[PDB]
Design an enzyme around this catalytic site. Sequence first.
Site, mmCIF file in Angstrom:
data_model
loop_
_atom_site.group_PDB
_atom_site.id
_atom_site.type_symbol
_atom_site.label_atom_id
_atom_site.label_comp_id
_atom_site.label_asym_id
_atom_site.label_seq_id
_atom_site.Cartn_x
_atom_site.Cartn_y
_atom_site.Cartn_z
ATOM 1 N N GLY A 198 0.751 -1.254 0.000
ATOM 2 C CA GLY A 198 0.000 0.000 0.000
ATOM 3 C C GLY A 198 0.782 1.306 0.000
ATOM 4 N N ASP A 199 2.052 1.253 0.354
ATOM 5 C CA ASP A 199 2.918 2.447 0.365
ATOM 6 C C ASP A 199 4.321 2.024 -0.045
ATOM 7 O OD1 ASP A 199 3.567 5.171 0.742
ATOM 8 O OD2 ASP A 199 3.722 4.952 2.923
#
Length: 300
Positions: A198-199
């Site tokens: 996600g990041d």
Amino acid sequence: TVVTTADTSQLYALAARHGLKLHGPLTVNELGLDYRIVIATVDDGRRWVLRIPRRAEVSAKVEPEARVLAMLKNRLPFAVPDWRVANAELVAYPMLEDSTAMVIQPGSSTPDWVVPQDSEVFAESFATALAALHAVPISAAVDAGMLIRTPTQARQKVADDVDRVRREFVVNDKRLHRWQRWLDDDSSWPDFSVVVHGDLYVGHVLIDNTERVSGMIDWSEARVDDPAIDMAAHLMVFGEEGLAKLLLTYEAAGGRVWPRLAHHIAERLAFGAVTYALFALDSGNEEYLAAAKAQLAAAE
Ligand SMILES: CC[C@H]1OC(=O)[C@H](C)[C@@H](O[C@H]2C[C@@](C)(OC)[C@@H](O)[C@H](C)O2)[C@H](C)[C@@H](O[C@@H]2O[C@H](C)C[C@H](N(C)C)[C@H]2O)[C@](C)(OC)C[C@@H](C)C(=O)[C@H](C)[C@@H](O)[C@]1(C)O
Ligand SMILES: Nc1nc2c(ncn2[C@@H]2O[C@H](CO)[C@@H](O)[C@H]2O)c(=O)[nH]1
């Protein structure tokens, strides 16, 4: 005495409440808007990362992230933080001593170093590590209480983020039409979701001395969602040639692909402007807001 940025007495007391005895050198990063990050030496002779939530709304995210990391530990062929302390006032884990795949001085806008484009060991091992992450069963994510998005929910989230930016900012017309065209382009979107970091970018990937991926850190955005989320930053840093190599090896390692994946990844990267603008808005930081507004109004 000498004035120092770290409040050693408060840090010692905080750590000691959670069974860690600080002793020796420490370093502090107070630039994060949600956490203070300290790398501290403990009486086990080891360095530990103290991830200190700043506010109640940040503390609320600790327990769910702890469940994510607990589930992922045995299911990845690389290291993740081992949160041996995880509570509302402190997260702490033994430092994973391997370097990040970039190096940047806190506060700086320019890295000192990024793993080179021509590092085949990095490129290859990042591709296989990503395939391994994306192979984590969705059942395991559900059992761990992760945020789950079906393909329809994944696309709806992007639509909602775009619409929030449209409500709060004035966006260049061509950007808006790009995002809308993407949202309407059925062939771009995957027909499945996976466990995503996600990041994910070079600053959250750890490498050994040979530049082989050995770990990943900073899992706060992890969820089940569109796989391309985890490939946008690779395109951003290593270009289309880097992306092409990633997709070939990712697929060979068992990663599930679809025909317009490379296109979709570029559209996800463009969508980074939306992510940044919402981060800016939610941060209340005038400098980040100034940058976001400037980017959004600019033609791409
Ligand atoms: C190469 C090295 C550079 O890295 C990148 O450009 C990545 C590819 C980015 O991810 C890209 C790609 C992306 C997919 O993220 C991985 C995308 O979401 C994003 C907004 O920009 C970053 C990681 C972004 O952070 C992310 O910004 C989000 C708004 C919140 C995220 N997190 C929840 C706290 C945070 O990590 C950020 C804004 O950079 C511009 C961080 C900001 C401090 C800087 O400008 C930096 C000095 C950088 O330019 C860099 C470190 O020099
Ligand atoms: N090498 C390394 N860096 C870390 C670790 N934990 C945190 N960091 C750094 O501190 C930031 C905030 O967690 C990260 O993005 C890294 O720069 C770790 O275990 N190993």
